[PDB]
Structure formats: structure tokens, C-alpha cells
């Protein structure tokens, strides 16, 4: 089991860390959503699908920078939605193929009443998402850590 991004950077077997740079909508209105869709960025696969089943969860999701200060919302994961930042581990997603499959995670953040001006700065860190992978075979318990960065500034009208 190993995951990689759309620009090619990969995390090998056993877990690790990587960086992701996402393009955000330059403006968000009050009462609207800022959508951060990572199902088009992170993909993984099962190396031995004939004999092993891999289970994947979102162990933790934390907010940083402007997302922490100016936003609130939920996270979409495998048929349901949960508060973001997370308060517990999610259900499990099954990986059973050698072909890459999306990691179905998306953020839905709304501006708080104090948000105004440049809410998120370009090149800054907005979230850290931990991917926990177990299996059907042994005691392997690995963490794939993803750091999410903003590729542009986001403004909120006041």
C-alpha cells in the first residue's frame, strides 16, 4: 500500500509525509462554501489484492493559518460528513485493487462573521490530514500525513 499525488510525489510503503498545493476559488461570499476537493489529488492502491484487504480511515484533520481563524465547516468522507477539525476517526474505506483509486476527501468551509479581506494567504498551510492504513494480514499500522497548502490568496467581502 502506497499513495502519491497528482504531480508525482509519492509516499512509499510504511507511511510518510508529503505536500499538496491546491487551487482555491479567489473569492468566497458570506453564506457560501470554499470547496477543497482532494479526490483529484491523492490516489492509492493495494499492492497484493489477491490475498490482502487494506482498510483506510481519516484518523485526524486539523486546521491551520487562515482556515483555522476565518472558517468553519465539515469534511466529506465515504458517504457521510463530519465536523472539521475532526473529533474522532472515520469509518473505513476498502482498497482491493492494484490500480490507483482516489482518496475520497473534500472540505466544505464557510466564512465566520469576523472574516474579511485576505482570508487565506498564498503559499500558506491550511490543513493536515492523517491517513491511517491497516490490513487483513498482520499488525501493520501506518500513517500517511498530507500537508495542504494554498496556491493563491482568497478574499471575503465585508
Amino acid at each position, epitope marked *: 500500500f502506497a499513495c502519491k499525488t497528482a504531480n508525482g510525489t509519492a509516499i512509499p510503503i510504511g507511511g510518510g509525509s508529503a505536500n499538496v498545493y491546491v487551487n482555491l476559488a479567489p473569492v468566497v461570499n458570506v453564506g457560501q*462554501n470554499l*470547496v477543497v*476537493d482532494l*479526490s483529484t489529488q491523492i490516489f492509492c492502491h493495494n499492492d497484493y489484492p489477491e490475498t490482502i484487504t487494506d482498510y483506510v480511515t481519516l484518523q485526524r484533520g486539523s486546521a491551520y493559518g487562515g482556515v483555522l481563524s476565518n472558517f468553519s465547516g*465539515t469534511v*466529506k468522507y*465515504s*458517504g*457521510s*460528513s*463530519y465536523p472539521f477539525p475532526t473529533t*474522532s*476517526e472515520t*469509518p*473505513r474505506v*476498502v482498497y482491493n485493487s492494484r490500480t490507483d483509486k482516489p482518496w*475520497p476527501v*473534500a472540505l*466544505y468551509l464557510t466564512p465566520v462573521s469576523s472574516a474579511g479581506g485576505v482570508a487565506i494567504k498564498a503559499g500558506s498551510l491550511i490543513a493536515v490530514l492523517i491517513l491511517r492504513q491497516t490490513n487483513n494480514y498482520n499488525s501493520d499500522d501506518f500513517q500517511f500525513v498530507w500537508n495542504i497548502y494554498a496556491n493563491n490568496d482568497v478574499v471575503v467581502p465585508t
Partner: antibody, heavy 117, light 108 residues
Framework: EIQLQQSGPERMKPGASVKISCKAS????????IHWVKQSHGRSLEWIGY????????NYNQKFKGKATLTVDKSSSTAYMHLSSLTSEDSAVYYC??????????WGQGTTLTVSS | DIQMTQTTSSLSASLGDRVTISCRAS??????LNWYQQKPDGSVKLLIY???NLHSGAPSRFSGSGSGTDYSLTISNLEQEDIATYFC?????????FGGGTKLEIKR
């Protein structure tokens, strides 16, 4: 308040196909998932599948793959269930429900389907 | 897929009683266990989600507890409004599965 409105009762013939709708109101339509549930005469509940309104990715029960299809129209905040090749076993009550925190927090009123010649 | 089993199909009780409905899972679920109520007219409502959390609008008589593979729903002071059928449901793995149902009855 949050409401899910389904279409009225149906009466199809064997071998036909039926479409039912569920209109959501009172919340941001694309922020949540929509699930579908079947209850047969006998009151056992069966999970059918879910669909993401944001990008239309679907997940189905293996029991219902091929027979059932889920579609969405985000312009009107409406979801659809299509069931093809109807037999007598297909007579039941079908539900739409919004999903939050792993649970089905709000349910529609249900749609009764009758398959008879 | 994960199998769900409720202890009894029917359960008699009386007004003012304390009622317990238990659910059991073939495989451990990570507290993703839900309780639903269905009235005789056929309408479904969510009572408890994530094993302990009152859904907004539910009466305070209802409570949940459990972990691993054993879960229970407790009604504190039964009322005629509570005479319904109750379902447990797990959401740890796809496909989501439901319990068989337990229908409440009035002792006589």
C-alpha cells in the same frame, strides 16, 4: 426546516422501469450525501446506495447493482432513483435520506411501488 | 458484510417502565451505531447517532450506550407515544446494514 419530498405512489407492470424523485429543501444541497433505503412488506430495512450531489459519484449495494441507478440534478436540488426490469419482488417502500455523522438524520416520507399485471 | 442482530422481535412493556433494546454486531464497529424509530404510519426518525448522541428534536428519555459489538437503547419513562419499532444500523463499512427491528408492546 429541512424537508425531503418524494413523489407519489406508483403502479407498474412486470418488465417495466420506474423513476422516483426526492426534492431537498432547507439546506445547501451539495454539502451532504443522499442515501436510498428499501423496506419490503415484512418491515425489514435494506440499504441501496448513496450519491454525492457535488460530482455524482455513486456507491451501490452489491445486491442492487445493475437494477438500480442514482442520479442528481443540482440545478433543482432533486435526486432520482431508477429501477429497471421490475418483478413482483420489487414491491416495497423506498426512502431518500440525508446523511450526517454516519447516520441518516432526515428522511423522506416514502414512496410505495406496486408491481402487478 | 457486517451482520446485525437484535435480541427480540417483540417486547412488552407498560407506561412508566424503563425499557432496554439491545443490538449485536458480527464484527466490531468503531462506535458507528445508530438507532431509528418508525411509527405505525410509516414515518422514520433518527433518535441516537454515534452510540450516545441525541439527535436534535428527539425526546430526552432516550439514551444510548455500548462499544465494540454490543449496544443498547434505553427508554427512561415509557409513554404511549413511544409504542413503535426500533432499528439499529451500523456505518463502519459499506454496505450499511440494519438490524431486524424490535416492536414495542403494551403489557396487559
Amino acid at each position: 426546516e429541512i424537508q425531503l419530498q418524494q413523489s407519489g405512489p406508483e403502479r407498474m407492470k412486470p418488465g417495466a422501469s420506474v423513476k422516483i424523485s426526492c426534492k431537498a429543501s432547507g439546506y445547501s444541497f451539495t454539502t451532504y450525501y443522499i442515501h436510498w433505503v428499501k423496506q419490503s412488506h415484512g418491515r425489514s430495512l435494506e440499504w441501496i446506495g448513496y450519491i454525492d450531489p457535488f460530482n455524482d459519484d455513486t456507491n451501490y449495494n452489491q445486491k442492487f447493482k445493475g437494477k438500480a441507478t442514482l442520479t442528481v440534478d443540482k440545478s433543482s436540488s432533486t435526486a432520482y432513483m431508477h429501477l429497471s426490469s421490475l418483478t413482483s419482488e420489487d414491491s416495497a417502500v423506498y426512502y431518500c435520506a440525508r446523511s450526517y455523522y454516519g447516520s441518516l438524520d432526515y428522511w423522506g416520507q416514502g414512496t410505495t411501488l406496486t408491481v402487478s399485471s | 458484510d457486517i451482520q446485525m442482530t437484535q435480541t427480540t422481535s417483540s417486547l412488552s412493556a407498560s407506561l412508566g417502565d424503563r425499557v432496554t433494546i439491545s443490538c449485536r454486531a458480527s464484527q466490531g464497529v468503531n462506535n458507528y451505531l445508530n438507532w431509528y424509530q418508525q411509527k405505525p404510519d410509516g414515518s422514520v426518525k433518527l433518535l441516537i447517532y454515534y452510540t450516545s448522541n441525541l439527535h436534535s428534536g428527539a425526546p430526552s428519555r432516550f439514551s444510548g450506550s455500548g462499544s465494540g459489538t454490543d449496544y443498547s437503547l434505553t427508554i427512561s419513562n415509557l409513554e404511549q407515544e413511544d409504542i413503535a419499532t426500533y432499528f439499529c444500523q451500523q456505518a463502519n463499512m459499506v454496505p450499511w446494514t440494519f438490524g431486524g427491528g424490535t416492536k414495542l408492546e403494551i403489557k396487559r
